């Protein structure tokens, strides 16, 4: 049907603010946001892969795209989260 | 194994008459004395952003030499497409 | 007799014509290269550069600055002045959305 | 056992993988790429919700509304940079009056 | 129909923009600017509608038109 | 009778309208304008309601941003009243 | 080391429009950059069009709509005219 | 086998239809590509090339030069409103700018 990130947004919200809710419009805005950043990152990764004549998008391409896309401290923290997640998943 | 002299104060190589000449191309007839430092700062910021992106591309390819194509892509993704340096 | 001495502004205008007619790069090659290498060194040490990469960077920098000076001049003229000042640059960059 | 559970994440890794496969981005997709991407998206979501919650608490509201999201984004330099060209519907603007306009 | 964008509405918009005093000639100028903006967006929007061989402009059509002009809008997905 | 000085009510309105978020142009005339303009590209078009609301959000946000920049241009010239040449300067520098 | 470019086609067009005019190497390089740029823009816009409508094939229709989106006014009308004429002549 | 005819020749074009087709197939733009799409695309690219070269030739003759150089391309682009719109965010290397002095700066 119509997919959204609503349930995941809600889980994150409960982690960070147990006593805070969210309106329907705000959840819709969050979904728009997530889709936007998704498209940007996937597109940048696509160009990265083409420039280097590689046929596979790997986590390394994701990381480089993240470094291009996000400024400064946001980029560093994102890289930290990505690395921890890949390391925990791998084992 | 005979590296160049450590780079310092190179912002001063952007001389006063050079900035004046650039301003002439922009149609500026008279120039306040304080313009020069401001211009230097702006230029430095611009350069930082470009070089950062270029080097990121260079590292992704696991190369140690920044190429013209690296620069073209960096500029392109900032909406300042440059013609003349392809291939 | 009195030495020949054009009034303030004449030579500036003649320079405007001169430099808008031609296309050669206006900053010295080598100091610019040193600037680029210094800035680059604060991200990763020991990088090398292809010549045409530096020439491309120079084209981009000078074009960007030329555009900034056009907008700065328009901002100065708007305030019924003829001399550009730092606040004009800051207004131009604020409206472009860089700050 | 889900891959998200093995990765310690809340965002759905499987769904992101399917969306990459069908988004015409590349011929192949590595196993780690959707994990990394999901982690980044979850981190950013957490950052925005953190600030928006703070703004909500300043406004003594228990539910985050679009106004709080706009306030949160525009008051953070790096988020504002990231979303410099984004319009939040019903977001309004930041309270801001130029000093020259005040009397005296 | 351009006159339906009334003077007090433009005044209110300017108030949100922080404008304290407004010359009488601003209003007509503003209307012209608005018209141009709308035209461009709508021109693209209808194009998407026509490509889909539909007769109803959808919200998604508008969102895509706005996105491709670099004015991404959140909230209507 | 009591009378407030010029500007006091303007400032009150600034605070009022920056505090809230409701749309400021009337719905129906805006819709009428949209349909009139649309009519000059293709006949007989209809519109979903949420499409018109989206267009209205975009238009008002765009105008608000333009007025911020216009105000900065006016203040730069040491005036407090915005004039058409200010709008034209702002639009030229944005690149439209 | 074989690098393709549009040089020979640019040169043929130049000879069609200005029989006694030449071109420097730098200008030909600029033309190649130009052609690649417009190519990428059009192909990308066409991809988005196809994606939005859940079609898996890019046809001449998508090209035409993309052309109308990217080019302004009379340039767009003339380009559409050329494309349509070319496709109809090709089909016969 | 039938005598080789090129699709560009069948379309009356100068730009290489086959090469454009190959680049579309390998550019990962869509899963499938129609037979008519590269013909249309080639025609549009050829037309735009012709328009730029037309203006650049005019500029070249105005300057009494027989070879088009980048300066002429920059002049051609900035003096045409629709091309200037299309290439509003493009820098032409070695292009310079249009001669232009604000009227208020000239003497009275």
Author numbering:
A (entry chain H): 33 to 123
B (entry chain F): 16 to 102
C (entry chain E): 36 to 134
D (entry chain G): 15 to 118
E (entry chain B): 25 to 101
F (entry chain A): 38 to 133
G (entry chain D): 32 to 123
H (entry chain C): 11 to 118
Paper lines:
We found that RAD51 forms multiple conformations in the complex with the nucleosome, such as ring forms with eight (octameric), nine (nonameric) or ten (decameric) protomers, and a filament form. Notably, we found that in all RAD51–nucleosome complexes, the NLDs of RAD51 directly bind to the DNA wrapped in the nucleosome.
The decameric RAD51 form with the linker DNA binding is observed in the presence of ADP or AMP-PNP. The RAD51 ring forms bind to the nucleosomal DNA and incorporate the linker DNA into the central hole of the ring. In the context of the RAD51 decameric ring with the linker DNA binding, the L1 loop region of protomer 1 also contributes to the nucleosomal DNA binding, in concert with the Lys64 and Lys70 residues of the NLD. The sequential contacts at the 136th, 134th and 132nd base-pair positions from the distal end of the nucleosomal DNA by the L1 loops of RAD51 protomers 1, 2 and 3, respectively, are distinctive to the decameric ring. By contrast, in the decameric RAD51 ring, the L1 loops of protomers 7 and 8 capture the DNA near the end. However, the RAD51(R235D) mutant is markedly defective in both DNA binding and nucleosome binding. These results suggest that, in addition to the key role of the NLD, DNA binding by the L1 loop plays an essential part in nucleosome binding, as seen in the decameric RAD51 ring bound to the nucleosome with the linker DNA.
